[PDB]
Design a protein around this nucleic acid. Structure first.
Lengths: 332, 106, 187
RNA sequence: UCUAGUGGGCCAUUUUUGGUAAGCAGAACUGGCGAUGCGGGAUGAACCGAACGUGAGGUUAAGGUGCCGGAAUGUACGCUCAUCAGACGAAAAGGUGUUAGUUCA
RNA sequence: UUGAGAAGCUCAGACGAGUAGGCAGGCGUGGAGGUUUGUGACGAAGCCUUGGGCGUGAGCCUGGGUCGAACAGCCUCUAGUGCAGAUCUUGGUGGAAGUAGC
RNA sequence: GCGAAACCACAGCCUGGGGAACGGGCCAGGUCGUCGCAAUGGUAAUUCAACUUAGUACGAGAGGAACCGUUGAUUCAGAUCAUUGGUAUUUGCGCGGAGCUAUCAUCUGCUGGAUAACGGCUGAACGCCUCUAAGCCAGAAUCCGUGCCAGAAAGCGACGAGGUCCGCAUAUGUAUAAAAAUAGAGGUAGGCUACUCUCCUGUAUCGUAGAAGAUGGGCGAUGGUUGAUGAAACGGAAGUGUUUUAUUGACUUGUCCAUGAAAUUCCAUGUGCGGAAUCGAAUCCAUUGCAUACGACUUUAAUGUGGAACGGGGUAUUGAGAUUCUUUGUUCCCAAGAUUUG
């Protein structure tokens, strides 16, 4: 409690990591998303050589306490216009996408079964009935805005999570002109983007998230820094946990699924270290506020071998498949 | 509607007072347009009223008036001392008063 | 002299204390006062002088930095804020930075008893409230100093249109013979 | 002629003696408070005005007239810009800090 | 001109702090002698009341409500005659508090 | 359920002063949600230490820069709990699942300006000179912001989703929008000017007739004000208003006439509540530990790929056996009821 930077200690209400500071953008920067929401799949340690000038282990293999984060491709389903005002940054108008999933529409409804599930139903009506109104809203944003952010909802359905309400986060498109940001979001309306597009995995991502509730112990949003990604493995990729050295195919999901999360089916990001918040928690992977040029960021990741020993429970093998012939024929 | 208002606008500033003693029997009135004690000599003896409205429709009307007269100038800036038939309420500080042109000597 | 229901004051070049005392007396007189361009107020004394005054104030309370909040504090100290009369008078004051849209299309007056050019001796150092606020915590200086040109450009265009429109009646004035036929009345 | 009550002090001023690091203490004197409310002094037991039946009107005292706060953001002539102004001993000095003048020149 | 409760009426001027203390005039209570050829079941006394009035005041008169058997003004006599205090007496009732607790 | 007593002048937020405490009491001050902005605070990493970078330039040499990464570590902060240690009613089989705690498995703690001293540039005073006097730059472990932690239970913006019956009570002309400085500006023909003009406050400009503003005849202009709608543009800072109108009607004070004004015979001047039949939403609720003295909080139960419990199985545990997230199986549950407002 000595550091008053985190004192007083109070639990953060929103489970989703909130981007209190988005990265600065300029017209020279190409239009791109700055944040991508992920889920705490796991954080087993995997070996990787370190090619770093002056490293005591220069060109030497190192087991690293990395972290796999399930990242279902985010869907942009709306935009918000932010007008620069002498009293702060105000939301000019919000232009949603015409059609919304039940999951994101469920987010608004506390119960979702109540009577009619009317989320944006008339809004979907007036959207199609009067597209010109949306055109004027887009025109108003392009004419009277400086900060354009996009409404994005989580594809929890791909993830093995009971929660149905899609987490909605207001990711900010960065770079280019305001009209370019509106145009990108408009053409991307009701469309999903993988984190592999948002982050290149060589980029240093200051993932932020809410610390878990210890039982005011814990439950506080925190911003990790200096966390370069190591492998943005896609879900369709079954070679994601198989590097060049361990060429043998192995899914990122280890034996016995994941601890209190289940298997990974969608894209994931590999990153060394640990982050606040329990397993399968919505984690805000976001662009680094500072363009830090540390040699750790400069050096590339050349992952030696992905640990896939058993999740919840105990496993002494990388995958059962090799263990099948490794052990003698079972009684079965 | 600029064919009315035979009166002059005025404001009820305060009562006559020292630093710590107030005298509600005489009120200090700022007639607008009057900017010195020599111009305040024109409005001496003129009828001044406070016009307000109350909830009850007594007399079949919604408006009631407290009448008064201007006695003497106050200070150098053209404020005047007015004595009303009933002492003006302290809540009417900064309220508006009407200074007629009668009794006229012009 | 005469009062209006709402008086809009352009605080550019007005001394803080002189304007606040005039405004406070007008508020107690039963008038609604709006002060725009509160970031353009001037204070006698060099930059370091009121810097230490405000820095000492920071040492002391809810420290406000915005220029209007500085002016609002100055006016409040000149009011009987411990009584209902003082509180009611305070609520009739609306101090803002810049000129918001409801007020940029309304006439703005100035207080000669508070103007710097008529009260401060030439060659005396002065500290603008907006500049002084910018380094003590206020962070909206750049964006309001950028938007003013947009307001000025629009207002300048309006004045040119009004002046061009006025030229027609001005020419038509001397064109009509009755203007000079009965101009012996001084009109 | 008799006939109730009191047989202190405080604020101190002034004159004044001794002083003694220096303050301070000791006499007399002077009045006031003590039995006395009121205007002022931001507030104030002793500072400036003024001493009191109930009221109306007028006019003042001491203090004041940017706002709080009643009353000129009055007039005229000067000093100062203090980043610890001013408004109410560290003080000796230092001021390539000044404003006016005097002397010698 | 009636304006002789001569203890009345009238005219004038000045003055107005006040502890201890001194001196006048009054208000109220219980009882007594006299008086009002007094008040009262068609409602005495008491009590209540954001009703009205009188007096500088102590106090007094009165309307309404309640109530149910006695009571008052004036002149004089008399005294167990007037309360916010006494860590006052007696009685009643509060906050603590539905708390400490059983 | 029963049930006290002590105590009680009276209220009760702080910083200064009120001289005799002054204080406590004086004076002067301090509908439901979605997704976001930030008034205001707090702040953190302190870092070095040891091998290169080094026996490095420079230094006769010794000493030792600049220098560059890495490896770690002193202390303290927020933490994940993957993997591992412990685990510990799996009461499954000492082990010990599912998960928790523990760096005992691991993350893990920011960065750009302005400046102090000092050092300079410009340059007077004091023809030069002079960091300084007008000023500027460099420059501290300093300061300010940035980043982080929160947010203002009564701080706000965008965004999605109360209405109908019954009863009852019933200001005076609100007229005026460039900016800018006084070592001055505005605009100015002409083609960047040149020079003139204007100020020298609004005592101005706009409007101002009508028995509170009538009825008519009109006339001049054949048009200024407006009402009513149909409208399109512009306005984002809090646009909520600026116009453009298309007409439809009027007053038209533009002007000239005819009627009416009086015994006021001298001033007094739909909206709200209380009920219902309704439509949604939220809470309780099936709930749950995510939260937990209790409050209060978070998820899931509305006719379905529904949720939940079993029959189980997987995962691992275990070390031939058993157990427990998952299940195209079965059934329960079911348009799941009340409360609350809108």
């Amino acid at each position: 409690h000595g550091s008053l930077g985190f004192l007083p200690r109070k639990r953060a209400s929103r489970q989703r990591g909130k981007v209190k500071a988005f990265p600065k953008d300029d017209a020279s920067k190409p239009v791109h998303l700055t944040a991508f929401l992920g889920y705490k799949a796991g954080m087993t340690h995997i070996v990787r050589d370190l090619d770093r000038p002056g490293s005591k282990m220069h060109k030497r293999e190192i087991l690293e306490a990395v972290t796999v984060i399930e990242t279902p491709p985010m869907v942009v389903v709306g935009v918000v216009g932010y007008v620069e005002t002498p009293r702060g940054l105000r939301s000019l108008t919000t232009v949603w996408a015409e059609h919304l999933s039940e999951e994101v529409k469920r987010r608004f409804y506390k119960n979702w079964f109540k009577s009619k599930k009317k989320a944006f139903t008339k809004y979907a009506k007036k959207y199609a009935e009067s597209t010109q109104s949306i055109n004027r809203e887009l025109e108003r944003i392009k004419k009277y805005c400086s900060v354009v952010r996009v409404l994005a909802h989580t594809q929890i359905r791909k993830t093995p999570l009971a929660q149905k309400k899609a987490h909605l986060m207001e990711i900010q498109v960065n770079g280019g002109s305001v009209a370019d940001k509106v145009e990108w979001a408009r053409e991307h309306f009701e469309k999903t983007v993988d984190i592999k597009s948002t982050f290149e995995q060589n980029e240093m991502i200051d993932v932020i998230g809410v610390t878990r509730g210890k039982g005011n112990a814990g439950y506080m949003h925190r911003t990790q820094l200096n966390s370069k990604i190591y492998r943005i493995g896609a879900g369709d990729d079954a070679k994601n946990a198989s590097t060049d050295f361990d060429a043998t195919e192995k899914r990122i999901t280890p034996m016995g699924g994941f601890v209190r999360y289940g298997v990974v089916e969608n894209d994931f990001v590999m990153l060394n270290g640990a982050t606040p918040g329990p397993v399968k928690r919505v984690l805000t992977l976001r662009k680094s506020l500072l363009t830090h040029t540390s040699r750790k960021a400069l050096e590339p990741v050349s992952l030696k071998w992905i640990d896939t020993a058993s999740k919840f429970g105990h496993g002494r093998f990388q995958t059962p498949a090799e263990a099948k012939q490794f052990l003698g024929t079972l009684k079965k | 509607a600029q064919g009315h208002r035979l009166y002059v606008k005025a404001k009820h500033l305060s009562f006559q007072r020292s630093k710590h003693v107030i005298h509600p029997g005489t009120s200090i009135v700022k007639i607008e347009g009057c900017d010195s004690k020599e111009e305040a000599q024109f409005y001496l003896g003129k009828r001044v009223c406070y016009v307000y409205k109350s909830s009850k429709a007594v007399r079949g009307s919604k408006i009631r008036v407290i009448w008064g007269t201007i006695a003497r100038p106050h200070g150098n800036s053209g404020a005047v001392r007015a004595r009303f038939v009933h002492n003006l309420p302290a809540k009417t500080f900064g309220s508006s008063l009407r200074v007629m042109l009668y009794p006229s000597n012009i | 002299s005469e009062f209006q229901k709402v008086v809009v004051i352009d605080a550019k070049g007005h001394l803080l204390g002189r304007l606040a005392s005039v405004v406070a007396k007008q508020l107690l007189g039963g008038q609604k006062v709006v002060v725009v361009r509160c970031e353009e107020l001037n204070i006698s004394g060099h930059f370091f002088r009121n810097k230490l005054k405000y820095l000492a104030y920071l040492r002391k309370a809810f420290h406000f930095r915005a220029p209007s909040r500085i002016f609002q504090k100055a006016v409040r100290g000149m009011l009987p804020h411990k009584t209902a009369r003082g509180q009611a008078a305070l609520e009739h004051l609306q101090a803002v930075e810049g000129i918001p849209p409801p007020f940029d299309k309304q006439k703005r007056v100035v207080v000669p008893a508070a103007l710097r050019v008529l009260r401060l001796k030439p060659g005396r150092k002065y500290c603008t409230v907006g500049r002084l606020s910018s380094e003590v915590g206020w962070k909206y200086n750049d964006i309001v100093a950028k938007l003013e040109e947009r307001r000025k450009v629009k207002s300048a265009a309006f004045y040119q249109a009004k002046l061009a429109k006025q030229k027609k009646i001005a020419s038509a004035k001397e064109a009509s013979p009755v203007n000079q036929k009965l101009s012996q009345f001084g009109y």
